[PDB]
């Protein structure tokens, strides 16, 4: 929750581009480690989505040149398809709640 708060306040006060300008792979990887820990949470997913979107749109080709960050994107794709399935089944359960009311 404390990392969530400081993420929120950095995104609110400043912009995430100036937050992520002079990054290399070794300082990109703890961000993404925290992402793989915390995208699964209901409260933070939109904020983490903003942050990973701006860092990918900045670091498009450095993603190619650095190999292990590619593997981070692969397992990120796997777990985010897991959340795809979870949220879609959730909308299904909401539809059957609308049936039962």
């Amino acid at each position: 929750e404390l990392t969530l708060t400081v993420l929120q306040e950095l995104r609110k006060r400043g912009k995430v581009r100036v937050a992520l300008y002079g990054r290399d792979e070794s300082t990109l990887e703890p961000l993404l480690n925290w992402c793989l820990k915390g995208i699964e949470d209901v409260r933070s997913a939109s904020i983490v989505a903003d942050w990973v979107a701006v860092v990918l749109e900045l670091y498009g080709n450095t993603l190619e040149s650095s190999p292990v960050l590619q593997e981070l994107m692969i397992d990120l794709k796997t777990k985010v398809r897991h959340e795809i399935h979870k949220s879609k089944e959730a909308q299904r359960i909401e539809g059957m709640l609308q049936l039962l009311t």
């Binding site: 539809g95 609308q98 049936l99 009311t101």
Partner: protein, 188 residues
């Protein structure tokens, strides 16, 4: 204006010869009597007797009629003419009435028209899909065919695959120095 309507500026002259914010502000400041005497100008008055409105201008009413009842509205909806009236009256009922009122009205509604509507949508629009949600929640759980369930199942499955792929396409359109040895050419 009342005397002109009884004996029957632009609308007044038109009515006298036949016998719209500005129009509304000039002819809405008696009105019930004028409407009764009236029942073009009717279209303008609609823009500005729900049973009469239902018995009746069809397009003008289904977009801009002030008073419209759920029973005749669902009867005109389950008329399977389908001149885009499905989307039109679906938007109209989702604009005008509440989901529980539509639920109890479709509980009142006979099951044969429900089955015909399900067959029509599965054979040949988020308002329409919300109407399918509503009609499922009004029929409940017991009386519904398994074969029609499977047809609606394959229909909804192919539609949700194309909806997913469509959303991904939508967001997709929403989106050192030289090496240690190279071989390069030169001009003259």
């Amino acid at each position: 204006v009342i005397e002109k309507l009884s004996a029957l500026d632009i609308f007044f002259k038109e009515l006298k010869i036949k016998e719209y914010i500005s129009d509304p502000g000039f002819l809405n400041k008696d009105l019930i009597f004028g409407k009764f005497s009236g029942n073009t100008f009717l279209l303008t008055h609609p823009l500005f007797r729900n049973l009469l409105s239902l018995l009746r201008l069809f397009k003008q009413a289904i977009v801009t009629c002030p008073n419209l009842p759920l029973n005749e509205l669902l009867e005109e909806l389950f008329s399977i003419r389908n001149r885009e009236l499905l989307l039109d009256i679906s938007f109209r009922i989702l604009q005008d009435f509440t989901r529980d009122s539509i639920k109890q009205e479709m509980k009142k509604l006979s099951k044969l028209d429900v089955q015909n509507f399900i067959e029509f949508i599965t054979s040949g629009s988020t308002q329409l899909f919300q109407l399918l949600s509503l009609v499922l929640d009004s029929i409940g759980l017991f009386s519904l065919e398994g074969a029609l369930l499977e047809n609606l199942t394959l229909y909804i499955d192919k539609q949700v695959e194309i909806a997913e792929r469509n959303t991904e396409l939508w967001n997709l359109i929403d989106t050192r120095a030289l090496p240690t040895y190279t071989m390069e050419y030169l001009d003259i």
